């Protein structure tokens, strides 16, 4: 009877949450209207983790939708398999963040904080456990970044003992994307350092190349990309919902993957992944899945792990198998590629097993790793930050909305010293 609220923020957070609330809706067997129509009580057992029940067959999802774009909110509420949302938890502004962390944090942020936190607590006594919060947003965005990190800060100071899954999507480090990408990225990760238990980061460029190289299907588009996003959603917290063998919930993943409280940023991966014309030519077995997880193409945070090491990693195998093969392959990875790992943590590769396979797959695997490869992303974000900050470009927006250079410089100092801990614990020997 453990509880996860999934309260989304921003345009990117709203899109990935709509994909979440449809990919688990057909997983647990719920139509777009809301009535259950599945064919197994394995779905029916732990619906309560995500869905607040109502009269009839209504299973409306417990989700504080936070946004500032009425068009985005309308598209989310009018999308297929997504009109199940209750009218109560539809808090959204009309001014909009306008791609600004400070505008989404202070002007449009703090006034919305009261109503949003009211909806959060209204869904918080309407449960039994409140095992964790799940905030999904984007680094570099306007609405999801400032309002989101303010929501981590407030929920962390008001319930200071529960897991906060920050499931954030970073944009591509190249081209330009948003003009204040390093500013919002630095500020958001600065709040995520000392207020979040655990954080997943997804890169859009890596989503592009994993949907283009292995998945093919000509252009990658966006729907398949967000389908892997929702697959990582439904794969990380599947021991909490579906029963099976050896289990690992959010707290167990946090304690097995966070050695030090600052270093809790993870790299996800979903690795059943084959194209249309190569699915009959590929035998699917746990060694094949393990090869696909540890293959660096499936990393969706960019950050090629061969330019670094692995502090810890966890694999959630979701589908019935033999754990002899899982143990064999998880040991063999360490034993042969022991140089690209850490020698001061014995057996840093972890496993969890759930029995129920996902929709249309014999077995699946979610691969999430705390590694040193993301220090490259953090240091290049800091480099772009100082490059666009030494000329004080777009400082006037943040100072008008209520920020200052002291906040900017302490955020980048926090980013730099987090890079320092990654480099130090990469170079640290056993004794």
């Amino acid at each position: 009877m453990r509880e996860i609220v999934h309260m989304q923020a921003g345009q990117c957070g709203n899109q990935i949450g709509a994909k979440f609330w449809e990919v688990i809706s057909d997983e647990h067997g719920i139509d777009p209207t809301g009535t259950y129509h599945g064919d197994s009580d394995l779905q029916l057992e732990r619906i309560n983790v995500y869905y607040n029940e109502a009269t009839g067959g209504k299973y409306v999802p417990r989700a504080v939708l936070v946004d500032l774009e009425p068009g985005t909110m309308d598209s989310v509420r009018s999308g297929p398999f997504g009109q199940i949302f209750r009218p109560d938890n539809f808090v959204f502004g009309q001014s909009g963040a306008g791609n600004n962390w400070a505008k989404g944090h202070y002007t449009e942020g703090a006034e919305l904080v009261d109503s949003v936190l009211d909806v959060v607590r209204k869904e918080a006594e309407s449960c039994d456990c409140l095992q964790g919060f799940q905030l999904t947003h984007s680094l570099g965005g306007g609405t999801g970044s400032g309002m989101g990190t303010l929501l981590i800060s407030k929920i962390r100071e008001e319930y200071p003992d529960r897991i906060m899954n920050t499931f954030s999507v970073v944009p591509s480090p190249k081209v330009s994307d948003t003009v204040v990408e390093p500013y919002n990225a630095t500020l958001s990760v600065h709040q995520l350092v000392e207020n979040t238990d655990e954080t997943y980061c997804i890169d859009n460029e890596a989503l592009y190349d994993i949907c283009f190289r292995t998945l093919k299907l000509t252009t990658p588009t966006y729907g398949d990309l967000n389908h892997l996003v929702s697959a990582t959603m439904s794969g990380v917290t599947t021991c909490l919902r579906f029963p099976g063998q050896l289990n690992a919930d959010l707290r167990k993943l946090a304690v097995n993957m966070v050695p030090f409280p600052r270093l809790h940023f993870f790299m996800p991966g979903f690795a059943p992944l084959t194209s249309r014309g190569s699915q009959q030519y590929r035998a699917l077995t746990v060694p094949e899945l393990t090869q696909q997880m540890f293959d660096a193409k499936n990393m969706m945070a960019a950050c090629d792990p061969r330019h670094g090491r692995y502090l810890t990693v966890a694999a959630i195998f979701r589908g019935r198998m033999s754990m002899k093969e899982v143990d064999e392959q998880m040991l063999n990875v360490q034993n042969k590629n022991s140089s690209y790992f850490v020698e001061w943590i014995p057996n840093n590769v972890k496993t969890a097993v759930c029995d129920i396979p996902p929709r249309g797959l014999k077995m699946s695997a979610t691969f999430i790793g705390n590694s040193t490869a993301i220090q490259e992303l953090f240091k290049r974000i800091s480099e772009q930050f100082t490059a666009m900050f030494r000329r004080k470009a777009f400082l006037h927006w943040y100072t008008g909305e209520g920020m200052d250079e002291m906040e900017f410089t302490e955020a980048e100092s926090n980013m730099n010293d987090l890079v320092s801990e990654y480099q130090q614990y990469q170079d640290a020997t056993a004794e």
């Binding site: 249309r276 699915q279 929709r359 249309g360």
Partner: peptide
Amino acid sequence: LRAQQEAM
């Protein structure tokens, strides 16, 4: 196989 045929 049924899910595969539904996919294609």
